[PDB]
Amino acid sequence: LVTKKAYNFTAQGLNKNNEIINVDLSSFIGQKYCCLLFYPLNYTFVCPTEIIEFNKHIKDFENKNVELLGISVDSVYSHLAWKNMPIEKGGIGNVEFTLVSDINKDISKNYNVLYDNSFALRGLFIIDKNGCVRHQTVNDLPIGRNVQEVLRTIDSIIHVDTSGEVCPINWKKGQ
Amino acid sequence: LVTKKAYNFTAQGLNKNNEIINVDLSSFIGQKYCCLLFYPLNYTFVCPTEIIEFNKHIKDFENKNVELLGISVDSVYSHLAWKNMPIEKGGIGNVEFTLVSDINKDISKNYNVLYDNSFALRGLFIIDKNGCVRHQTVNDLPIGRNVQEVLRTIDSIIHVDTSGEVCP
């Protein structure tokens, strides 16, 4: 997937104002980077803590001109219920980014993260302003993502885009 | 590939004593975790510093019972030449882990990291002691990997194996 053109999905999403919107990946072309964050909502593997942590740092994504999109196979109702649920009860609160409903499973399939025709694995992708996939990580299902690591990854991609440098040497940065 | 059994391969490798050996991935099952570090040796994208940094942390991999395997499409000669090349000329030095030669491209193909049927992308996989793929990352070609991040990932996998905690 990395180096190739990202699968351009169209799906319903629930935005930061809890409005149902049509989310079209191609709308961000020439405008914004995207970070696609896939996750499961089954009780065995659900991880509200990682979503809460991404939301805590949402302005860091905004500062970097990155649209964060959470994606799962579950319905718009299911996402709204998760946002409305108390944190103490396993909820995520009213997070400030869009949650996308992959209800036909084609988004997870086309990002190679659909498990058993059932749910999305813990996948993460960074999409650049040309619509190209620039990073792919699939974490072990029980392990949440580290938002600081994701933001550093994004930083490196932005650096490549602005400088064209391959592998830059750390000590020499200044010079 | 994550959650599925790793593609087993048998390939030539150049070990830490610069001997050419047989590298059979299935030989580590029940014995050690493996970290498969794919990389390009292509002039445009070659990144010696990332290999050097992983080598500097080889005692951490050993302490975690992880076999680190560098994999590229290039010959054993190329790997030996790269090890012998001075650092200031783009060499990696005599690294203390095995470099595997994926000459026929089958390993890169089966791990979905072959670019333009030519060279390997910057893929990394962690395989557990049962031979299951537990983590997969593919970095942008111009961007080297961060070994400290890899080591934290391995720590998390080992913690799951020993504790069974979801989302600790």
Numbering used by the authors:
A (entry chain B): 21 to 195
B (entry chain A): 21 to 188
Task: Show passages lifted from the paper.
The structure was solved by the molecular replacement method and refined against X-ray data extending to 1.8 Å resolution as described in Experimental procedures. There are two molecules (A and B) in the asymmetric unit of the PfTrx-Px2 crystals. Each PfTrx-Px2 chain contains five α-helices and nine β-strands arranged as a seven-stranded β-sheet and a pair of strands connected by a short turn. Embedded within the structure is a thioredoxin fold encompassing strands β4-β3-β8-β9 of the β-sheet and three of the flanking helices, these being α1, α2, α4 and α5. Analysis of the PfTrx-Px2 crystal structure clearly reveals that the protein is in the oxidized state. There is an intermolecular disulphide bond between the peroxidatic cysteine, Cys67 of chain A and the resolving cysteine, Cys187 of chain B. This is mirrored by a corresponding disulphide bond between Cys67 of chain B and Cys187 of chain A. It is known that oxidation of other peroxiredoxins is accompanied by conformational changes in the protein in the form of local unwinding of the Cp helix containing the peroxidatic cysteine, Cys67 and a reorganization of the C-terminus. The electron density maps around Cys187 from the B chain indicate the presence of two alternate positions of the sulphur atom, giving rise to a double conformation of the disulphide bond that may be a manifestation of the mobility necessary for the C-terminal cysteine to resolve the peroxidatic cysteine during the reaction mechanism. There is a conserved glutamic acid residue, Glu70, near to and buried by the disulphide bridge. Its side-chain makes ionic interactions with arginines 142 and 165.
Peroxiredoxins (Prx) are ubiquitous peroxidases that reduce reactive oxygen and nitrogen species such as hydrogen peroxide, alkyl hydroperoxides and peroxinitrite using an active-site cysteine residue. In 2-Cys peroxiredoxins, this active-site residue is found in the first turn of an α-helix that is able to unwind to form a disulphide bridge with a second cysteine, the resolving cysteine (Cr), close to the C-terminus of the same or another subunit of the dimeric protein. Our results show that PfTrx-Px2 is a thioredoxin-dependent peroxidase with a preference for H2O2 and that it structurally belongs to the class of typical 2-Cys peroxiredoxins. The preference for PfTrx2 suggests that this reductant is the natural substrate of PfTrx-Px2 in contrast to PfTrx1, which, as a cytosolic protein, is unlikely to encounter the mitochondrial peroxidase in vivo.
